Amino acid sequence: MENFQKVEKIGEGTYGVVYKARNKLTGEVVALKKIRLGVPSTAIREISLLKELNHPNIVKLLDVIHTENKLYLVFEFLHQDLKKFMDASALTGIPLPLIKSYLFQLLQGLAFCHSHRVLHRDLKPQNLLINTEGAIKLADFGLAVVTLWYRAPEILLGCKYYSTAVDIWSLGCIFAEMVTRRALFPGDSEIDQLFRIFRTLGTPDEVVWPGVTSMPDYKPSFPKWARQDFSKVVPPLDEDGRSLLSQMLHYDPNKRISAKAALAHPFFQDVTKPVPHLRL
């Protein structure tokens, strides 16, 4: 790690602390992540797998530094996250063509991960990175106050062996947030998160989600709320966007649209790649 000059702290995550840093030998500007822990052998193999999971919409893992019984991940650096961009665009809103481009690119990144049986598990605006070229990239995955706003209901209900559908749920929540300029389900506890989902989409039952009542944390005593219309949930999003969002937010993970099928949805018929106005 003596090969890198730290410039500034850019974040703190579940797995560790991230710095903007400069390689003293190549002059390369990178994101250096110090992993929070000797390093287990299983961790080294799983991280070695991430190195090969390369795609234009996945933040590149340049190098894995396992020296002096410490672990550092050297990543590609991007200048802004979607959280800061959404905050900067709050007065006017992100233009719909740019929302659509970002959603389309992230679904391409997800379809790629998911085809290699790799789940993100914790998508959120803070780990979605953007550049001046109009690209958006997935970061902070592959090592498996905590934000619960994007957590799929099967995780909250105690599913131990959840699927790639949890990522589709998170991305649908982020899509809604880009459109409305407000978090869709801003829970501040696991039950508040669950009940916020239930108040908008209706308390799930065996009809809409077969097997829901036998889930580890399901309680028959859950209040029974009626579902709201999507026209009320994400105005002024057009019918194509609302249709896609409804499929990304299906309760049953088996009914929830896949990343590959979402890419063929009519909402992306007129997709383009606009360039954002970034203030760096």
Ligand X SMILES: CC(C)COC(=O)c1ccc2c(c1)/C(=N/Nc1ccc(S(N)(=O)=O)cc1)C(=O)N2
Q: Which residues pair with 76 in a beta bridge?
A: 30
Lookup: tokens for 249? 């937010």
Q: Which of 3, 7, 11, 131 binds ligand X (CB under 6 A)?
A: 11
Regarding 136 and contact with ligand X (CB under 6 A), the answer is no
Residues in 77-106 at the binding interface with ligand X, rule: CB under 6 A: 77-81, 84
CA nearest neighbour of 175 among 111, 106, 87, 75:
106
The minimum distance between CB 201 and ligand X, in angstroms, equals 27
Q: Is 167 a catalytic residue?
A: no
Q: Point out the catalytic residue in the list 63, 122, 217, 229.
A: 122
The minimum distance between CB 7 and ligand X, in angstroms, equals 11
The minimum distance between CB 137 and ligand X, in angstroms, equals 8
User: Which listed range, 6-14, 44-52, 196-204, 228-236, lies at the site for ligand X (CB under 6 A)?
Assistant: 6-14
Q: Which of 101, 105, 127, 247 binds ligand X (CB under 6 A)?
A: 127
The catalytic site residues sit at: 122
List contacts with ligand X (CB under 6 A).
10-13, 18, 31, 33, 59, 75, 77-81, 84, 126-127, 129, 139-140
Binding residues for Mg(2+): 127, 140
Binding residues for ATP: 10-18, 33, 76-78, 81, 124-127, 140
